[model samples]
Target chain A: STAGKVIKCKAAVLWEEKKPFSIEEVEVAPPKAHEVRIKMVATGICRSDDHVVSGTFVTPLPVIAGHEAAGIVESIGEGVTTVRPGDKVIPLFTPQCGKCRVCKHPEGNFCLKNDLSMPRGTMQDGTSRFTCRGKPIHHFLGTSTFSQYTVVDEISVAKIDAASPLEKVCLIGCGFSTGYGSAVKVAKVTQGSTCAVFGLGGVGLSVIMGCKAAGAARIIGVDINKDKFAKAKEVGATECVNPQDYKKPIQEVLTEMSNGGVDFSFEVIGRLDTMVTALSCCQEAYGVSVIVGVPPDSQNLSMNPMLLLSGRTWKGAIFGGFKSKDSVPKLVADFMAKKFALDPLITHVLPFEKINEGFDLLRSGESIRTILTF
Target chain B: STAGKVIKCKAAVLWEEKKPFSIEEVEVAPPKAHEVRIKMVATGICRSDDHVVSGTFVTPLPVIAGHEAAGIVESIGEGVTTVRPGDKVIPLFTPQCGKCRVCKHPEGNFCLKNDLSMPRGTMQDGTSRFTCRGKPIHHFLGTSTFSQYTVVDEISVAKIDAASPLEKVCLIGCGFSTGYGSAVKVAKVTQGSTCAVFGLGGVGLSVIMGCKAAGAARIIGVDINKDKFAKAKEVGATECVNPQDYKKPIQEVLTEMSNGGVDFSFEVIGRLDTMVTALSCCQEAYGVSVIVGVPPDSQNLSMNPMLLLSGRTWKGAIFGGFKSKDSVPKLVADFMAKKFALDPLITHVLPFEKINEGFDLLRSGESIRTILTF
Candidate 1:
């Protein structure tokens, strides 16, 4: 008998690149050794998923897409000790194998163990658990939460409080953590410091919240669309400026607005020009520019080396520099205690059958985050 | 009648860009308020001085070039209290005006007071202290040490022990501190970390000393010229590589040699290509690239943003991150205690008449450092 049996379920699958997902029956295997199988309760539509389907980043086809998800642990394999049946958990796209060099060190959240399997979109053994049309299908970021059920490494699933609502906390799986952690954890933004957030999407708004919680004196939100400004200020942005209003480059405008340049800047828009502008509009000395956006793989960023030479720093963060299993549990606990607010971020909640509509909402920028309920 | 009387001294002056220095009797004004007059004892022929004459960086014509220097306080102006008339000191090209915002911050060595006047090549009061052919000649970096005597802001001179030889200690004024401090201070290179230094001039060699003192496990010195390798190893480089010898990009070769990439990398060569390579050869997750060389103003450094997004950091250091007046005395103390070694880097010493020859030696790559003794 197989150690863990297969379970058939409905999943939103991208059979080809640049193609919309089609709902189809897929077979998801039970948790293998050191794995936990989950019944996904909620998932958030994230820009990274859109990037993969739109070919901004290379996408391995015939893979299930969703990664920002929360669920209930339905079962656990032989060596799985982190979670069990009935436990509420969030599956980390960026896993933290505590034993890896990165996990032991403080500078990175990327664990070598999960990194080895992530690119292949399969388990550590280089085998796929999902099958459609009687052919093996790959996972996405080792989570593939678009499927009603998902199997993940024990290192990738963080168990949270049972009382916390999965739909609200689901946003934390990706966008929220990426933005919030980037400011609070990676930048370690000091009190009364000035900051600028370069996007007004879910991640960008989260950055404003993180900055506000960090006691930033001024939080400036930048975006081309003036419509997002109201929500941005509602979250925590002290001032919102549309780059279209300025004759000069946005960086120059921001630099002029602030006496010199802001103490910190975050690039949440994946455009290369915005990324460069984010770095350029930092204070001359001791300014920190954190790149939270992921640009297209083929694109190169050009900058005057003098920007860094004059004492500004350019750094980046993935999942807000959180150690997945080690940090997420505490984040969940904090969310339960209201250390960070999350209610305002969820603009829509729709059933799983309307998942494609949620994606459309994300594309239209009409919704900050749309939760897809099973 | 003047607060401090003027003196006439022989100085090497550049009458125009792309021209040779002419030895002439220039009228040197005495120290004004908060200024100190210094008698040049020794000055190093650094590439920056050559850059001014060669038009790599725009230098206002009729400027005296030398900046890396050591001298004696010949006289002090009304508000000068830091140094007395007989004090031995190193004149800082990157001055530390203790009152400026940058000077007060722990993160930068750049002083706003000196920076305001550096580009115009004059003192803080917006006037020149030297006159040649009866026309006022602009100061260079507020301390034109090419002259037999120079007037500097009181905050720009770091008083050192009288026993330390002005010739050897003179290197500490720029090159030594710029490289050494870039490692020990800016990078804060950890013990047992791997490092790659790109260049083998006086600054690069000083980087090795700093890295070694920081307890680096491996120090790889990179240079196109093989002649500098032996000296590189003599000054604590564990290994040396000639990028010219490798068919592949130096970054790839270095990455392979380190089994991944170096924990720290420094680019002391001002070319854009080397600066990019210097950043590329750093470790994947936590590598730090420190740019020590000043690139040409027109060139832009281009790189894949993914490199930084993958957890690497791009930064730079000026004056090795040392606050001029605040940090230099401690460095002199270290040199005196034998914590740092400087004797091996000086390859030649000549009188004022042969100052241009020293620049030729530097251009020809025949010397590490050549001191012009006044």
Candidate 2:
């Protein structure tokens, strides 16, 4: 049992930004009070990890990077009550301390205990649980799920259905939840409405699925790559559009396609231009635009306030505005009941040792999601 | 009573930008099909008119600039059924053509026939109502009450209670409605929430009254001028703050004052900087920032996407997000019921000849609202 002792495990660590991950055996300390140690079963490569590698989404260096993963709780720390040994779980980057002001709010899912707000490489106690070659390694998003073993605060690990497969549900930890919840929770897509989704990645496709489930009359998929159109349509997109194919602005083209413009538009492309474009593509006055993308750390989104002044709404959320502790389990159960298909989102699977190739597949756009199994 | 004949009246005309108002005897044309001719009883000088004077908010040349006003329907054209001659009414800059896409929608107030959207400077059929010395003078926001007689689409006028005073309720047509409706409708401000209002003008003060009516526990009024503080508190502000008195960013100052900034923030100053600043001053995770202020036409609002990605919402509205033809009557009735007071917002009452003096008073920030009675 690894209840009270440090565990030596393999983890993908980035010594610096703009460098490839280096897989090395690191010592992961046991969970402290109110924490849980999870043995990662399968983890998915996300664009956010690549963002950190490309030095856009800034975080502490010499850190483990990965947030979307499903695992089994190997041990529980003192005062931990949510999970125990042999329980299947998923680690949340956005933690839900239900007592915090944000967690208690009627709307919004940004938990106060989240590390993304104020990125600290260490745990709540101000010390890292990871060490390699006698040097302390920083944690990423407090989850650090790239490692074979990870420890997170009790509020950060959600106990899911034990019968579910880890590889399929892993996407729910980040991408799937982010996009699906954006449409359903944050945007609250109305029935018989028109929706435009920018990008056709796993997140964007998930948004389409959500829009379909919400009974949207028209779901328009937007992307530069024509290859993503098939999969997007397969996942409930009624039509696909390429901005490069149009002579005018993409928003104008979208406006022409729908009467005036789409009722709802989502920016899933993590680019400042797309964020504003998504907002502009919405029908003015009654339009709603939501940003699901994470842009560069230094850039600002500049646009005329007239876009909002015309009675449009602009909003963004992390974790798809889901309260992880409260919603992730239900989402996992929903998947188990075949509420949504995860098979379409996964295009590549590799052994833990071949994790670098998994990211390569993601970078080349050949794979929507690459799952690496231990 | 003038019914079918073209009426001649004295009106304030802006021949060009950065120029004083020229009051002259102008010919007021009769109402056409689906239009109503209103005899101006009282009109309010709004900052939007001043924006035209400063050359910030661009519109057509030689325009009559006035939106907030209350009057009696002097004549009605063919197919006009909502209002008739002798009915007490308020002209809507935001006309609710109830058959249009936005008017029928559950949210938003931007109607299809609104002049601000297209800026035709004419009635819906594309012709001016006022002619000055053989030159056609344009209409401002379709409700151009700077002229003694203004013709507007029947959908652009709302019939109020007959016993109501036109001068007192004239502010309801724009400032009071924009500010109050922004609080109750746009933000849907919750009880016990902490709110911050930027600028203590009539609109800002109306926002305070609405916040108080909504049962907000703490309302913090923000302004550069300390003189506005007394009126702000008297309306509803629990505490008042001067941004110039603080050395740090106003948002940071507010965050320290409130636990993590205010639940809601309203920008009523019509400046780009304050629009973004008001959004920044909101409490992240569940904060909702609203822009009631209209910024410069050429300027764009720039802010980091992270501000929204952290689960904050940014929104703006015209006419306080109220459906003009539908909601205005009920709002006026609410005012008549003594649900809220509008007297605190009116500071100077001037005659039609002193309209230029009213604008000067607004330029010096010496008056909250200067009502011009004909």
- Each candidate: what lDDT? 0.86, 0.90
What tens digits encode model 1's per-residue C-alpha lDDT throughout B31-68?
Answer: 88989999999999988888888776665768887889
Under CAPRI classification, how is model 1 graded? medium
Cα RMSD of all models vs. native, in order, equals: 2.2, 1.2
In the range B52-82, model 2's lDDT, one tens digit per residue, is 8887777898999999999999999988988
What docking grade does candidate 2 earn?
high
Kindly report which residue stretches of model 2 are placed more than 4 angstroms away from their true locations once superposed: none
What is every candidate's C-alpha DockQ against the true complex, given to 2 decimals? 0.76, 0.85
Best by TM-score: 2
What's the TM-score of each model vs. the native?
A: 0.96, 0.99
Chain A of model 1 scored by TM-score:
0.97
Model 2 clashing residue pairs (backbone):
none
How well does candidate 2 match the true structure in TM-score terms? 0.99
Q: A71-99, model 1: which lDDT tens digit per residue? A: 99888989877787899999998888787
Runs off by more than 4 Å, candidate 1: A1-3, A114-118, B1-3, B115-118
